[PDB]
Amino acid sequence: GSSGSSGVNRQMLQELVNAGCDQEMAGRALKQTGSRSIEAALEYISKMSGPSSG
Numbered sequence: 001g002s003s004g005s006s007g008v009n010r011q012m013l014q015e016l017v018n019a020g021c022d023q024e025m026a027g028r029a030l031k032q033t034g035s036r037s038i039e040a041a042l043e044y045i046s047k048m049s050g051p052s053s054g
Contacts, residue, residue: 009035
């Protein structure tokens with residue numbers, strides 16, 4: 001945004017979500033990581049738990 005953009009990239013979300021990620025979840029990670037990359041988020045969520053990935 002302008003005057004100091006404080007918040008993830010609402011755009012990147014629609015992207016990561018497209019794959020099949022929760023809307024309420026995707027955000028959390030996106031912020032935690034810092035709108036680094038679509039993969040970053042998906043990876044962060046798995047980091048915690050998830051014996052199934054790929």
